[PDB]
Design an enzyme around this catalytic site. Structure first.
Site, mmCIF file in Angstrom:
data_model
loop_
_atom_site.group_PDB
_atom_site.id
_atom_site.type_symbol
_atom_site.label_atom_id
_atom_site.label_comp_id
_atom_site.label_asym_id
_atom_site.label_seq_id
_atom_site.Cartn_x
_atom_site.Cartn_y
_atom_site.Cartn_z
ATOM 1 N N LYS A 1 2.804 11.377 15.194
ATOM 2 C CA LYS A 1 3.079 10.449 14.790
ATOM 3 C C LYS A 1 4.673 11.258 13.589
ATOM 4 O O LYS A 1 3.446 11.566 12.992
ATOM 5 C CB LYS A 1 2.624 9.722 14.185
ATOM 6 C CG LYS A 1 2.953 8.214 12.963
ATOM 7 C CD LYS A 1 3.933 7.793 13.198
ATOM 8 C CE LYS A 1 4.731 6.957 12.845
ATOM 9 N NZ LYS A 1 3.161 6.043 11.818
ATOM 10 N N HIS A 55 2.599 2.353 1.172
ATOM 11 C CA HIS A 55 2.910 3.249 1.048
ATOM 12 C C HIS A 55 2.569 4.118 -0.476
ATOM 13 O O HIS A 55 3.102 5.861 -0.464
ATOM 14 C CB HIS A 55 4.290 2.927 0.977
ATOM 15 C CG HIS A 55 4.788 3.033 2.987
ATOM 16 N ND1 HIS A 55 4.949 3.899 4.127
ATOM 17 C CD2 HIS A 55 5.229 1.980 3.505
ATOM 18 C CE1 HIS A 55 4.781 2.702 4.927
ATOM 19 N NE2 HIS A 55 5.397 1.781 4.707
HETATM 20 NI NI NI Z 1 5.621 3.301 9.922
HETATM 21 NI NI NI Z 2 2.816 2.282 10.539
#
Ligand code: NI
Ligand code: NI
Ligand code: NI
Ligand code: NI
Ligand code: NI
Ligand code: NI
EC number: 3.5.1.5
Lengths: 101, 566, 100, 566, 566, 100
Positions: free
Chosen positions: D216, D319
């Protein structure tokens, strides 16, 4: 109607039958209370209890199992002892016998 | 010294001659014998008897028991006695007088440093129940059963699939293997039943070699004479039990034809009364034969006011029938008869019906086998009084007859009585402790293989285990490896020989079934009556020796609204 | 209390019914899960009071009407089943087409 | 004889020509074909067809299926047909006509004593969903996903830690090893993603050899051209997939630079619309390329009235941004654009967006991938009518296009389509059974590897499995060893070769990923459109061939308030 | 550049000189040191520092940490400092400055691709608590303890049986073996205590060789001089700890006789104040000796208005006493003295009492060891002000003295301090993350062996992990094999040598206890006071050097009604 | 909220009490589990209000009378125990012979 109720038949139960017993006068000379159990070897109780340790040898309290006799400081009283059975081997307590007798 | 009987009972529990009422029913048991020596009873607690050099000795582990249940009132098929219970290696070690031989007389169960203590004074101890009619519709059934006091579960299924909904069958090697592996995760002894409906012996043998301890013949899969005879042939050669749910539709023949197909071979008839399945309207006549081991499923136990009303839709959903299809509704209706439902209660009381089971989520309640069995005992005493076998002013015999129905009899029937079924030395320590007020309803402690597996438990953060809320929670005996060690997975002799346990890598203890072909009605403890019973084809009336068998429907029962929140 | 798993499960039903009961009180047209919980809880209290299975099978069809639930909900519930402890033990109550 | 079509449907489910509405949406499917022989359908129940010598035969286990789903309406990318489904060894065996060859014609799926039966008449059967955007924030996500119909979960994480909160990364050998062991306890097929953000190839290779099936690239760890190129180089040499979350801040370059960094190599773009992450405001233009496999996360699906309002704070928490830091709030705001959100729905309808996923607890809802995909289908039909590919008076094609988005396409993208993704012979038996009224919302049965793993279950102590309260409970397929046998842990070819399974002592079945480098947009079933799409830098308007792409925000949706208690 | 201290604290947490209030108490800690380089702090999130080539480097797995806790305010016995914490291989790797050596100065904890990140800025990090007085009454106690911040549990029991209700003893080889296997299923480090009440050494040695790491002498099993001396002899030769619950009844002698029996050998005295057990009324005088390691159980901590009222019935139920038996009630009453209860709080403040424990469900609350310890600290500050050792205007020293009571001191006492007990390199990574407002009450994250095992978790289907309802749920570190790898089962050196782990097939990591005979009062961190203490036999007044020791009962406490729903 | 296992457990007690409370309101004679839950919930709210342990030990015996519960129920409950958070921490309340 009471769920799970007993219907105990009236009367009494004679405990520790056919066994030698003796009576002893005991006095608590300690400043703190002492409680002795039904199966504890009497001859090895707290040293503060003054009595004929020699007579209570191999004996325990003649009281229903699980009960006790309390001695408040300075208390004097006559108790009835019943002789140990089985192998008559004493192990533990204050470690005074650690063997048969 | 001397102590009054009342004070004595309050400390050590009732003794010889004292009577105790079972829950809120009209049944009273009387202590028949007490194995203690008065004044020498063992008791645990601060300043009590079980202490070093006193009621506890100096022996090594191998010379004393691992667990002792002190002052227990045992209720089993063999007696209702007061005694201590010693458990060693997960098995019942002795029933006698526990203590320290060094200073106490007649000690048969030595207590040492390695001995744990469970105080049973004032409690009733029985063996773990055995339900032989389990539909494995969901794993959640095991905990429900365990909480009620049933420690062994026999049956079949693969989960919530149409087949299992209707029948107790784990179809084939793959599913049998899967269910055997899944069984390691459940806190109860388990044994599987395969699908016995086939006219090819090899299809049955594979299943037996895969691991099942019996074969289920259900009509939903076709209970024809050919299928029945095939299953019995294999059962005969592999020493496994056959469970039967006969042909209700009389499609292949009447009850007498099914009986002809059986040909005198040993067989367990499920829900022998008929509501849960079987030839209409006379499957109940099977109880007259020596090779038939008859049992009842629980919804019809006992006969009450709401029994009938509740049955029709229950039956439709279970067997996947259609209410818009006339033949399907007539099928359901032909199975529900007030006449046989009423007779069933009496037949249990007489000992003609030898077992009680659930039929879990398939016309039965998994947590109500014990509870309903006692409800029948209560209703029968109320209606018929004392049994001809009673002696004394108690219900001790009726209690022995009924408790055998969900303990030893189910064990003898399925060939596992060598491991479980009763409180006898050498048997696995599956015991249940009850408080007299909650007997048969809510257990105080459920012991599996010598370890408590589930018990009522209060606030976890509390200063003691008693504060509310008190509800049943899993204990150490139900955890990972401890559980594997305390439960048994019953295999067939063939599967054991083939190394099935090793191949599937089963983690639990393995037990093997044996003696399934040789048990007969006469071997059912306190329930061996073979009555000359008839059922009128037109009126459905049940008759034994010409006299009419019947009972009245109850409007209220004990062990009901006084104990449950819902 | 010694609550068994089944009694604790029923506590989930009772609570779901509390949610539905309050919304109906606000005048909302109940949805599928709210309707099932409301009618189910009703029957349970019926058994607690001591009503027979036959009575409840009837009364269960008069708890909510078609104009009290969302569109399509009546058809999503061809029947409702629940067991409770009656004076004579646990019994199954089946209500066909509860919402009319 | 003769039977009316309505009565027929009521017994065996709909047949050729009949239409069925999917839940409460405006979508209708029409049975395209029926593989049965009328009058020879198999049905289970008391007195039904599946009985010894009738619809069930005399064959041994090896010659019949273990499980049969009778009269099933299959909905898959290849067709919407009525047929029986045979399952053997945990794999799909056949799609045809089940029965006994001894007395029935055209039997392709033999039913014997070893066969379990699941009645699917009147039910819709689909493959298990595959979510390729899982953040392993908590183990509880697996059951939530399984209950909704998703049987395979791909992603990364180590639990509730900052890194996993923001990105799908199981960082390094130790955590990868730990998560691989933990995966044995979960009832779903699992595959892990490692942290691909590094400019040193060896740091990536270790992770791949440790076991991850993909890497990722998340911007939270720096999605720079150097990092991207490094990950793609290793992916190319180890046959694993790369998942991308591009540089929203345009810090290292714009979208065209990222696309330059990729250099035509195969890559899976996460949340291609941009709300969940990616170059502002044109990451959506990635869908025009042949090497890009585009997917959407679920909160923006479909465009509704409350979509925007809900997004800002969701993004901040995910985030780890600060609302008191201007640059952090401007970052969040630059990601939420009504213009691209509206276009996304249309692009899915056209086949430009090929997958739908969740983004579990990191700007996504783990139990709503299936539900939202169908909500988009509904809203698009309502707004744009029939697709140019429709034939007949139904939505069969739109249904095939949309179901592929969470089944086969996610499987092709991650190189696991050889094991799962669709109902085709030889594939693992991960099937989901739905009642037409609850399609896409609440499953009737969830089957994993040939065993039911979770299903709605009523009162455990009830006389049948239907009484309330009915809620989802774990079944046998989710227990200990049975589960290990019914689930797959996907490893990389390298990890498999290194003996990772043996070293970590993994208990579940192992599957290896392959074909990750060769899939391209053209391989996405029913979703291979490569549109000439543009995004206006100032207005954010999306255009395909100059025409404006857009849709209207819904105020009410199906599969919403009519099914949920909260 | 320049940043104000307030803005700095808001982003990176407090720094040198800043003070923080512990929950809602009157205790304030002051950051003593900060190991960072200003402007070079590492922070994770979109567009933050920890990104490829920036705050994260190119090193391989072996050259960087697996987990980093950024900007953590550490509170331990050795200091209250601000620093990053690096964890590698499940062990504490370093306490310093984390980052990328390629571009940052003074980096001691390298962050690479294989590094997971937990953001601790604004949080307080402590080691996992250690409760050495656990009664294994139910498995549910482990989760309750873990949620409160206690990661290691020492004690004994076999479940809800009379013996375990009253004493911390796992009696014998069979039960010890069973409990050792069951321990693999629990998410906490565990060590077992056997029944030490026996006058035959061999009965003790077997238990030690079976696996126990200590022996419990409880009066319920007879705590006579002979039993005590026997246990100490074996402890001396096998390097295991002895836990003592003395003779309250003074049946075999007074406190001075027990002390004579001990003969200067190392021993851990449980509930040294006496309420939970011990010579009446002066067991508290044991704290004056060098070989005694004294601890308190939690219900008497701290002295409040409702303490006394609550104690009598609690004691009766725990020890199986009878309120209808005069001697039983007098026994209970002789144990509850307002005088010693009040002195206990002060003695903890002075460092005379070195440990705090629970006494789980046997006169103690398993989830309140940490919470009550801090309540005592608060009440003592309020009543006695600053300790003579304080420096500066804070309570840093009192905080170090108190935190040691449930961390390092319990570890030193039981010979496991080499594995756990504090945040020091090489020790197992059992850490607990707290938000200052919930310090000591509700943890933000509980890490076991380098993996989060339990944490507060919101809606599973939510778009982020924060939405309600937020309650504690098990994480990956508590699942199957991952858990086995992250927990330790402490064995005795003998059991380890005998191959007990291999024989029982234990799956968890094994740790061995050592150094139990050599620890003395002087080794108790910040709690080594040996006061010349006396207790008046008639009035029960406690005196140290003749001065009266006492305190006042609280009517309200912090960490109480403001945090709990019930 | 950060609900710990013990707080969630008490939610079970509170709900069981809601069930009992409503039945008593209907005028039903409460059974064993309903009685324990009702009196227990009472004490918990008592602690929340700030009443002392000694006060509650007394007041707990006046929640339900012998004529408000089913036959035999008073004898099935020799005492009731429950802990709750008082202003001075968790404390144990023991009520002997709660139903008279
Ligand atoms: Ni993302
Ligand atoms: Ni995600
Ligand atoms: Ni049947
Ligand atoms: Ni059945
Ligand atoms: Ni103690
Ligand atoms: Ni203790």
């Amino acid at each position: 109607m009471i769920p799970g109720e007993y219907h105990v038949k009236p009367g009494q139960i004679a405990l520790n039958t056919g066994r030698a017993t003796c009576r002893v006068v005991v006095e608590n000379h300690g400043d703190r209370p002492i409680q002795v159990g039904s199966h504890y070897h009497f001859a090895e109780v707290n040293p503060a209890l003054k009595f004929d340790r020699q007579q209570a040898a191999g004996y325990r309290l003649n009281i229903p199992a699980g009960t006790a006799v309390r001695f408040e400081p300075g208390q004097k009283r006559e108790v009835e002892l019943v002789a140990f059975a089985g192998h008559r081997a004493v192990f533990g307590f204050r470690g005074e016998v650690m063997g048969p007798l | 010294s001397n102590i009054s009987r009342q004070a004595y009972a309050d400390m050590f529990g009732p003794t010889v001659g004292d009577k105790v009422r079972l829950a809120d029913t009209e049944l009273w048991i009387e202590v028949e014998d007490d194995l203690t020596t008065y004044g020498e009873e063992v008791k645990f607690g601060g300043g009590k008897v079980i202490r070093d050099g006193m009621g506890q000795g100096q022996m090594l582990a191998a010379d004393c028991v691992d667990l002792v249940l002190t002052n227990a009132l045992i209720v089993d098929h063999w007696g209702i006695v007061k005694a201590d219970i010693g458990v060693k290696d997960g098995r019942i070690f002795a029933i006698g007088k526990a203590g320290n031989p060094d200073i106490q007389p007649n000690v048969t169960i030595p207590i040492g440093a390695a001995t744990e203590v469970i105080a049973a004074e004032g409690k009733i101890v029985t063996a773990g129940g055995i339900d032989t009619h389990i539909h494995w519709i969901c794993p959640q059934q095991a905990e429900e059963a365990l909480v009620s006091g049933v420690t062994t579960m026999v049956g079949g299924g693969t989960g919530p699939a149409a087949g299992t909904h209707a029948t107790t069958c784990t179809p084939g090697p793959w599913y049998i293997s899967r269910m055997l592996q899944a069984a390691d995760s459940l806190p109860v002894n388990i044994g599987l039943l395969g699908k016995g409906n086939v006219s090819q012996p090899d299809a049955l043998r594979e299943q037996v070699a895969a691991g099942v301890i019996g074969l289920k013949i259900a009509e939903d899969w076709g209970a024809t004479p050919a299928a029945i005879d095939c299953a019995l042939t294999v059962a005969d050669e592999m020493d496994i039990q056959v469970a039967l749910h006969s042909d209700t539709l009389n499609e292949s023949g009447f009850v007498e034809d099914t009986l002809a197909a059986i040909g005198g071979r040993t067989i367990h008839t499920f829900h022998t009364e008929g509501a849960g399945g079987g030839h209409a309207p006379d499957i109940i006549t099977a109880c007259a034969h020596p090779n038939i081991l008859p049992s009842s499923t629980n919804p019809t136990l006992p006969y009450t006011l709401n029994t009938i009303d509740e049955h029709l839709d229950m039956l439709m959903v279970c067997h996947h029938l259609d209410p818009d299809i006339a033949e399907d509704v007539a099928f359901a209706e032909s199975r529900i008869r007030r006449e046989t439902i009423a007779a069933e209660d009496v037949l249990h009381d007489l000992g003609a019906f030898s077992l009680t089971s659930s039929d879990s989520q398939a016309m039965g309640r998994v947590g109500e086998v014990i509870l309903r069995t006692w409800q029948v005992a209560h209703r029968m005493k109320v209606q018929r009084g004392a049994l001809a076998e009673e002696t004394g002013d108690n219900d001790n015999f009726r209690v022995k007859r009924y408790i055998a129905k969900y303990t030893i009899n189910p064990a003898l029937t399925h060939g596992i009585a060598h491991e479980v079924g009763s409180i006898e030395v050498g048997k696995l320590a599956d015991l249940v402790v009850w408080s007299p007020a909650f007997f048969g309803v809510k257990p105080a402690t459920v012991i599996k293989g010598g370890m408590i597996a589930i018990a009522p438990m209060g606030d976890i953060n509390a200063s003691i285990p008693t504060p509310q809320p008190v509800h049943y929670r899993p204990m150490f005996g139900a955890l990972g490896s401890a559980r594997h060690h305390c439960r048994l997975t019953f295999l067939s002799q063939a599967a054991a020989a083939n190394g099935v346990a090793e191949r599937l890598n089963l983690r639990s203890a393995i037990a093997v079934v044996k003696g399934c072909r040789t048990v007969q009605k006469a071997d059912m403890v306190h329930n061996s009556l073979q009555p000359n019973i008839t059922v009128d084809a037109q009126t459905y009336e049940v008759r034994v020796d010409g006299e009419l068998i019947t009972s009245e429907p109850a409007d209220v029962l004990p062990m009901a609204q006084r104990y449950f929140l819902f | 209390m010694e609550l068994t798993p089944r009694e604790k499960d029923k506590l989930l039903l009772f609570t779901a019914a509390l949610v539905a009961e309050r919304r109906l009180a606000r005048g909302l047209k109940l949805n599928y899960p709210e309707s099932v919980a409301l009618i189910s809880a009703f029957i349970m209290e019926g058994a607690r009071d001591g009503k027979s299975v036959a009575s409840l099978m009837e009364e269960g069809r008069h708890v909510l009407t078609r104009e009290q639930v969302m569109e399509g909900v009546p058809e999503m519930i061809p029947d409702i089943q629940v067991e409770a402890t009656f004076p004579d033990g646990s019994k199954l109550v089946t209500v066909h087409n509860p919402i009319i």
